[PDB]
Amino acid sequence: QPQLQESGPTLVEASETLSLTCAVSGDSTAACNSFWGWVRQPPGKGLEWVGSLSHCASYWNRGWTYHNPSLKSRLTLALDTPKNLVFLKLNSVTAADTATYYCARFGGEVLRYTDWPKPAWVDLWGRGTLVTVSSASTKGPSVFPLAPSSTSGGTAALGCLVKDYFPEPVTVSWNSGALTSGVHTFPAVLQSSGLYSLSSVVTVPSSSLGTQTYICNVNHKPSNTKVDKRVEPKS
Amino acid sequence: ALTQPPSASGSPGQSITISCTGTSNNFVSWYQQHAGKAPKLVIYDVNKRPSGVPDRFSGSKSGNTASLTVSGLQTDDEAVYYCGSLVGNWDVIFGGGTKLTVLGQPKAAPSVTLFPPSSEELQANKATLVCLISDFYPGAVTVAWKADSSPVKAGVETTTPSKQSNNKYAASSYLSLTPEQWKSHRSYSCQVTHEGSTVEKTVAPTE
Ligand SMILES: OC[C@H]1O[C@H](O[C@@H]2[C@@H](OC[C@H]3O[C@H](OC[C@H]4O[C@H](O)[C@@H](O)[C@@H](O[C@H]5O[C@H](CO)[C@@H](O)[C@H](O)[C@@H]5O[C@H]5O[C@H](CO)[C@@H](O)[C@H](O)[C@@H]5O[C@H]5O[C@H](CO)[C@@H](O)[C@H](O)[C@@H]5O)[C@@H]4O)[C@@H](O)[C@@H](O)[C@@H]3O)O[C@H](CO)[C@@H](O)[C@@H]2O)[C@@H](O)[C@@H](O)[C@@H]1O
């Protein structure tokens, strides 16, 4: 079956230009059955149409190009049919442009139509490539304690806030791996500043808060940084 | 715009229907997206199935409401489903997506822990409220924040629910404030909506 394969930079600085190429195999971008374009999806959110185009002309134009109206001022689409390539260019990117970008083949009333072709659904999807918009440089994390109270039915939650690092990933352990039961480390959030934050939490018996030391161990290999943070009960 | 409910659930072997309001024409499509994977077209033209899509997927439309029905749920059917449609002359829009869970364990209400800004973070001139949610199933929640009694939208970041070691789900939500606005209100609240239930935890700078 046909395949769509995106390629291009996955990190773009703020206000710069986002450019992506899509290689099409098993179908012809020159045929008139389909439109070709892009759909994007911010991490943890829904699908957002970007646009599509076709080089099959009617007798009153040289083809068709449809843009998401909120992106039109920054968006350029292109086709290189001899090479079977689809292109996306998006100027002046902000944090709101961080997303997984999917190359997409569109169907609908395309081959035969009244007034204008209507590419209405995506019948073939690329694997998608996550583009991150951030002007940040490599930076180690700041670790803050999430202290328990001296919390709920004999057990107490405590944890670590791992703030303002770049890039991913960060790994977290507790007590150098001696504490694993009841541990959960959460996915990272990309803040509007262009830096990541995550949290790690562990539930322990409240009776242990006075005698047992709890230390989260944060490893950020991209910056060759390790942070051990003692988490102590509130005063 | 197209409006989908955030989530739905059924047991293996049952039938389930999820709806999408706002569809004003027959250019309706449905997409299945497994976690970590690209979407896939499962219905087009209201009720047509692409080759390879089982006949237990079926689409329909009544008034301005499109519906996707899955007869005989299988565990592989667990995914997020989006409705799509042509709008205007030639635009494409999608619904917000419905998380469809195929029930494999008892439903479980979430535990919520709300951490105030740490003293260390306040000394670095920053303030982050941390709302940690754990031990719930299905893995779908809505998080809202309040300052005193007023809803708060700016400065909120929420992670997608991810599985714990005990195979229930956890999620996290953050409210970023300046130290001044943290001190200036009487309280802050994290509200977690799960199934037909909302749990709210509150913290106050005077604690
Ligand atoms: O779904 C889109 C939009 O729909 C609703 O808004 C309405 C829409 O009305 C457009 C237009 O429609 C009708 O004219 C149809 C066509 O008639 C003639 O053939 C010709 O005039 C066409 O003009 C195009 O072609 C000529 C020559 O080929 C070009 O020089 C000209 O610039 C036009 O080119 C645009 O359109 C063609 C397809 O027709 C595209 O292939 C081309 O790439 C270009 O598209 C860009 O610009 C579009 C805006 O014009 C934009 O939608 C695309 O995404 C892309 O950016 C003529 O189109 C008549 O009813 C006529 O009166 C209408 O103007 O768009 C208007 C402006 O937005 C809006 O006021 C109408 O109400 C809404 O639902 C809207 O939200 C939605 O986005």
Q: From the CA of B56, how many Å to the nearest CA of chain A?
A: 19
- From the CA of A67, give the closest atom in ligand 1: 54
Contact B172, A199 (CB under 8 A): yes
**CA–CA gap between residue B189 and residue A119 (Å, rounded):** 45
As for chain A, the residues directly before each break of C–N over 2.5 Å are 150
Sequence-separated (6 or more) residues with CB below 8 Å from residue B187:
B147, B148, B202, B203, B204
- Sorted by sequence, the CB contacts under 8 Å of residue A77 that are 6+ apart come out as A37, A38, A51, A52, A53, A65, A67, A86, A87, A88, A89
CATH 3.40.190.10 fits B105-207, yes or no: no
Q: Which two tokens stand for residue B36?
A: 């970590």
Q: Are residues A148 and A32 in the same domain?
A: no
Q: Are residues A94 and A169 in the same domain?
A: no
Are A179 and A87 found together in one domain?
Answer: no
Nearest-CA residue for ligand 1 atom 44 is A65
| Rounded distance between C-alpha atoms, residue B177 and residue B95, angstroms | 31
Same domain, A149 and A103: no
Question: Residues near ligand 1 with C-beta < 6 Å?
Answer: A 60-61, 64-67, 69, 72, 116; B 88-91
Do A99 and A19 share a domain, yes or no?
yes
Host domain of residue A152: 136-233
Phi then psi for residue B76, to 5 deg, are -65, -15
Q: Which atom of ligand 1 is nearest to the CA of B88?
A: 74
Shared-domain flag, residues A158 and A127: no
Task: Identify whether residues A75 and A190 lie together within a single domain.
Answer: no
The CATH number that applies at residue A205 is: 2.60.40.10
DSSP B113-128: EEEPPPHHHHHTT-EE
Question: How far is residue B107's CA from residue B195's CA, in Å, rounded to a whole number?
Answer: 9
The residue ranges of every structural domain in chain B are 1-104, 105-207
Alpha-carbon gap: A121 to the closest alpha carbon of chain B (Å): 6
Contacts B171 to A, Cβ<8 Å: 186
**Range list of β-strands (E), chain B:** 7-10, 16-21, 28-33, 40-44, 57-62, 65-70, 79-87, 91-94, 98-102, 111-115, 127-136, 142-147, 150-152, 156-158, 162-163, 169-177, 188-194, 197-203
Let me know: does B175 contact B188? Beta carbons within 8 Å: yes
The alpha carbon of residue B107 is apart from the nearest alpha carbon of chain A, in Å, by 20
Pick the residue whose CA is nearest to atom 52 on ligand 1: A66
The alpha carbon of A64 and the centre of ligand 1 are apart by a number of angstroms equal to 10
Q: Among residues A91, A114, A135, which one ends one of the domains?
A: A135
* Same-domain status, A52 and A146: no
CA nearest ligand 1 atom 12, residue? B89
> Do the domains B105-207 and B1-104 match in fold?
yes
Q: Single out the residue of A48, A138, A139, A135 nearest to residue A92, CA to CA.
A: A135
- How many Å apart are CA A105 and CA A4, to the nearest integer? 9
Count: domains in chain A:
2
Residues A6 and A81 in one domain: yes
A57 shares its domain with A125? yes
Q: Which CATH code for domain B1-104? A: 2.60.40.10
Q: How many CB atoms lie within 10 A of CB A44?
A: 12
Same domain, A106 and A177: no
